[PDB]
């Protein structure tokens, strides 16, 4: 396997501005009550500065990025709030969980509600006021009548109503006397008391029902530099009533809950504290500032209401603009996103006892596609598609010619304001198709010269697009969940080839058996939208796969009498244990006319399907999940994609690279250890003591150890039915591995993206706080 | 510059520059190698800038 490393693809990093979990905390249940909280959909939403709202799944420590919904040009996302109803109960004792709706602001006067089922924005609401800078959903004490409270630039606390699928500007509670008071952060102490921070050195405490004002907490000047007005960037409320507030001086103030006066000033940071987080039981405070510093506070033993900084550490490479916590189903994490696009997951209850985990800033979809017969590599971001041609092999080069080797060939700009959700290219590179959430555009290429093939019948956008290897079928995923397909007719002439794309012929997906309370509760019909669309190597068979684990396949029935029919064996293809992270057919054909559909899920479940037979292959009867190698079972990185060889399949995650010889069979991280949702247990350097020993027998020969705590019959048949695997970690920030031509030999383009200070924005320093 | 030779930090003082300020320190070094009253310090600064 020959590899072209490629760092010239300048993929843009974007600053994370808003991190918001679905549930802030789940109720603790036992192991005999483990089946109650199995269908609870906990999702993490992260909104970046380019308007990308992208849902994560914690996956009990898996952290799989599911959906990315991009906003347009000149569109950002500043705040994110989930609104989760309480648990409704049916007539029979079954549980309908809370429907969770996602709301956002975009530095405008408009609160947007997002439709995660259709993967676009659902509603907009706006009143006559200034730009909204902070907002939150009123907590539960009413039941069906919950309301959003939003602060803004010119002062007026507007109040929006959300009930029965509605989002409308209800009224305005109050506004400040001074027009120069800007509302920058908001947090609710109880059902009726809203604590807002302002720009004129105040923390006001309004009362939502009558709209009145309980008390105006104040803070002094900043005596570190100029600019006398302190700015309270983040307020939050402890469960016992106190208010924690990080401000412009880098302080963290603890305000009394009954009297609304301050009880403590903790000088923690050098530059200003930008975001706070409070543990669900009220035991830990995490503060993230502009000095890329994260500080952890626990209460001082003895006196009550007195906090103190346990320890601080610089986890990020730029400022920590947003963070949010979660504590439930055996997982207490706090996810902090900053301006270096890397969400960092810290363990909350084991903080100082387990390592953190930096999730990848590159998207989960590889976003790198190649026409290997034309040797075109291709990548897309905000509205442009960049296509490189490579002009030569690798065997030729075995350094003055390596600069001339690559060539920045084409840059296709998409009209409008929408953003390229996905793309695909034919194997000879003459057909390109790019999907926005408004339109699906198709371009024809001539070795360049680019023309736009007129699409008809579409106009509602899509999220995934695939083009057949014989360049006859164009299959997309309209509105996430509705898979459509269209024949393209290629008519040669005296000038060349030209393409006419037919009217999209929608193919229907199988009605799966899902109970009514599961379909009502949770996020709804969110996990129906198809994540992968995979054709076979000869395009006689389609398959799609969604986030719920469902794989639906289709066959081609020919005579233009070619038409797609559902596989009779489609219902035998089961729901996977998790979402399929990769799914593609084997390009090497079989001997029975059948295909070999390789699927890897997010739980490292490598398996291969015979879909026309409707069953697993005999190789995957033999090699189960406990037979996979340990450096593939313990990776903690989601397998971003595969590239094929003859008998070998090469896998690539974000950091790892694997090959498995799929012909042969197979024969450090702890497996029995139960940790939190971020990293393994620490080993060498920790604040927390590891070996605590007690001593009876004063001669000291007798010590103790004080722990610190708060198919055996199947395999006979499967072996009566009767290595080469390799891994590396030396290609660290892989955004995409794509094959090129020009056990067979294969060239490949590995495209990395290491983040530099030239990519991240400019750090800002006054006279006093310069770094070392 | 004598204080930055005595405190071991002249390499640290010169190592973080950009193009225009390297040209500025080179211009000072060229202008002031001529005086033998600080020829030693000026030549040392020019050593570190060449390296």
């Amino acid at each position: 396997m020959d590899i072209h490393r490629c760092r010239f693809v300048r993929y843009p990093a974007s600053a994370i501005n808003a991190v918001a979990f679905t549930h802030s905390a789940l109720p603790v249940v036992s192991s005999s009550k483990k089946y109650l909280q199995k269908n609870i959909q906990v999702r993490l939403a992260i909104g970046r500065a380019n308007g990308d709202i992208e849902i994560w799944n914690p996956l009990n420590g898996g952290w799989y990025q599911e959906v990315i919904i991009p906003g347009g040009k000149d569109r950002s996302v500043d705040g994110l709030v989930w609104v989760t109803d309480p648990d409704e109960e049916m007539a029979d004792g079954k549980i309908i969980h809370g429907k969770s709706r996602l709301f956002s602001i975009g530095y405008t006067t408009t609160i947007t509600e997002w439709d995660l089922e259709k993967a676009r924005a659902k509603k907009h609401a706006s009143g006559q006021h200034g730009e909204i800078w902070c907002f939150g959903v009123q907590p539960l004490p009413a039941a069906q009548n919950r309301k959003l409270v939003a602060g803004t630039v010119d002062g007026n606390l507007v109040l929006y109503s959300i009930e029965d699928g509605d989002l409308k500007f209800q009224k305005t509670l109050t506004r400040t006397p001074s027009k120069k008071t800007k509302f920058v952060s908001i947090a609710f102490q109880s059902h009726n008391i809203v604590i807002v921070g302002c720009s004129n050195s105040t923390i006001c405490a309004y009362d939502v029902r009558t709209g009145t004002m309980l008390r105006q907490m104040t803070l002094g000047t900043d005596l570190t530099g100029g600019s006398k007005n302190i700015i309270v960037w983040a307020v939050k409320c402890l469960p016992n009533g106190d208010i924690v507030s990080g401000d412009s001086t880098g302080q963290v103030c603890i305000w009394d809950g009954k009297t609304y006066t301050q009880a403590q000033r903790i000088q923690s940071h050098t530059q200003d504290v930008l975001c706070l987080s409070v543990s669900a039981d009220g035991s830990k405070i995490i503060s993230g500032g502009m000095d890329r510093r994260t500080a952890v506070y626990e209460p001082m033993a003895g006196q009550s209401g007195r906090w103190s900084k346990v320890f601080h550490r610089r986890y990020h490479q730029h400022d920590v603009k947003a963070m949010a916590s979660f504590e439930g189903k055996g997982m207490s994490v706090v996810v902090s996103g900053g301006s270096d696009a890397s969400p960092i997951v810290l363990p909350l209850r084991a903080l100082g006892k387990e390592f953190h985990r930096t999730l990848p800033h590159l998207p989960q979809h590889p976003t790198v596609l190649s026409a290997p017969k034309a040797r075109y590599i291709l990548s897309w971001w905000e509205n442009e598609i960049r296509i490189w041609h490579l002009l030569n092999s690798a065997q030729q080069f075995l350094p003055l010619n390596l600069r001339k080797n690559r060539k920045f060939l084409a840059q296709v700009l998409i009209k409008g304001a929408s953003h390229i959700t996905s793309a695909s290219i034919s194997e000879d590179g003459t057909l390109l198709a790019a999907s926005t959430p408004t339109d699906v555009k198709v371009f024809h290429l001539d070795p360049l010269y680019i023309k736009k093939v007129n699409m008809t019948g579409t106009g509602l956008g899509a999220t995934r697009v695939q083009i057949s290897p014989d360049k006859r079928w164009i299959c997309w995923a309209e509105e996430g969940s509705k898979v459509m397909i269209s024949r393209v007719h290629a008519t040669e002439s005296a000038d060349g080839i030209s393409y006419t794309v037919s009217v999209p012929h929608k193919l229907h997906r199988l009605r799966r058996q899902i109970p009514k309370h599961i379909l009502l509760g949770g996020l709804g019909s969110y996990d129906r939208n198809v994540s992968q669309i995979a054709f076979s190597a000869d395009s006689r068979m389609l398959s799609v796969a969604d986030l719920a684990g469902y794989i639906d396949t289709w066959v081609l029935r020919g005579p233009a009498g070619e038409r797609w029919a559902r596989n009779p064996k489609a219902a035998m293809i089961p729901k996977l244990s998790a979402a399929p992270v990769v799914l593609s057919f084997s390009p090497t054909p079989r001997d029975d006319g059948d295909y070999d559909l390789l699927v890897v899920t997010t739980l490292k479940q490598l398996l291969i399907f015979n879909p026309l037979r409707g069953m697993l292959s005999e190789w995957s009867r033999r090699n189960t999940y406990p037979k996979l190698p340990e450096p593939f079972r313990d990776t903690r990185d989601q397998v971003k994609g595969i590239v094929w060889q003859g008998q070998r399949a090469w896998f690539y995650g974000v950091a790892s690279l694997f090959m498995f010889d799929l012909s042969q069979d197979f024969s450090k991280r702890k497996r029995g250890a139960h940790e939190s949702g971020a990293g393994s247990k620490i080993e060498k350097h920790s604040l927390v003591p590891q070996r605590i020993r007690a001593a009876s027998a004063p001669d000291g020969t007798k010590w103790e150890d004080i722990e610190m705590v708060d198919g055996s019959e199947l395999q006979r048949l499967r072996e009566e039915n009767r290595a080469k695997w390799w891994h590396t970690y030396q290609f660290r920030p892989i955004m995409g591995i794509v094959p090129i031509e020009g056990i067979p030999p294969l060239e490949v383009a590995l495209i990395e993206r290491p983040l530099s200070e030239d990519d991240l924005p400019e750090r800002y320093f006054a006279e006093g706080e310069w770094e070392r | 510059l004598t204080a930055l030779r005595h405190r071991s930090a002249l390499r640290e003082a010169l190592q973080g520059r950009d193009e225009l300020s390297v040209i500025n320190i080179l211009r000072w070094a060229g202008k002031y190698v001529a005086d033998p009253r600080y020829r030693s310090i000026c030549v040392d600064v020019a050593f570190h800038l060449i390296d």
Partner: protein, 276 residues
């Protein structure tokens, strides 16, 4: 220590004697027990032991290994007879190589202790409450508060009087004061030499510093001027206790050596003075 044997409080001595090179044992003596030179053995611990301190009374004693720390509470209350002088010991590993420690008692009983361990990497770890964490097999998660300002090893850490402030001193010639009620820190920065030892007065007023250039200054608080200054000969010494920042393999490891003779003249016109 001054402990109560029957009803007569008297001195008990707690020695730390080696038995091998990296092991040692702590052994208690009365005066009449020292006269017969038999001692009540209390603990033998086996990781290069440094030092031993105890709280007021004789209730809790704190022994220090290189990486570990051994807290010991006396088993019975009121100490009826001498033969039942037994200490229950719990050992736990401090994250850095222990240079010093100061214990303050939280009180006429002994409710708790607060340990400040100044480690050789520069940090000061404050373990807030220990007897209520190791009094209770199973213990809860204990986690020290880290205070890192010194670059080299911190030579002396002491609590100050009421317990609001944590005063400290290292190689950087600066007496530092951790405010510890806020997050702030205030310091007396430019002394002559390294702050090698500090003590606090019986009242809260005075500090007394043993500065590394053979000196002692009794400072008064918030006047911060030396109300008593005593200086010695300050020449080159082959030290007995070697160094507090020669433990962690720095770039230049400090060696006790004399390379050249001391440069000194007795001065005529005043032969009692010696310039050196």
């Amino acid at each position: 220590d001054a402990i109560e044997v029957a009803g007569k409080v008297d001195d008990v001595l707690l020695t730390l004697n080696r038995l091998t090179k990296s092991s040692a044992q702590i052994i208690a003596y009365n005066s009449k027990m020292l006269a017969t030179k038999t001692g009540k053995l209390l603990h033998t611990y086996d990781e290069s032991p440094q030092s031993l301190r105890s709280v007021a009374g004789g209730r809790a004693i704190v022994a220090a290994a290189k990486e570990a720390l051994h807290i010991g509470i006396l088993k019975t209350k009121k100490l009826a007879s001498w033969e039942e002088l037994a200490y229950r010991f719990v050992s736990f590993d401090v994250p850095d190589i222990i240079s010093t420690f100061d214990i303050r008692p939280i009180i006429a009983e002994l409710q708790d202790i607060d340990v400040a361990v100044g480690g050789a990497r520069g940090a000061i770890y404050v373990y807030s409450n220990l007897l209520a964490h190791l009094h209770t097999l199973r213990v809860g998660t204990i986690q020290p508060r880290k205070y890192h300002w010194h670059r080299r090893a911190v030579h002396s850490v002491k609590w100050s009087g009421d317990g609001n402030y944590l005063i400290s001193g290292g190689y950087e010639t600066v007496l530092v004061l951790w405010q510890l009620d806020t997050g702030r820190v205030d310091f007396l920065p430019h002394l002559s030499a390294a702050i090698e030892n500090i003590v606090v007065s019986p009242k809260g007023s005075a500090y007394a510093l043993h500065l590394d250039d053979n000196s002692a200054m009794v400072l008064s608080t918030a006047e911060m001027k030396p109300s008593m200054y005593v200086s010695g000969i300050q020449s080159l010494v082959l030290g007995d206790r070697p160094s507090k920042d020669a433990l962690v393999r720095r770039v230049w490891r400090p060696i006790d050596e004399i390379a050249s003779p001391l440069v000194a003249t007795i001065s005529p016109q005043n032969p009692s003075h010696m310039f050196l």
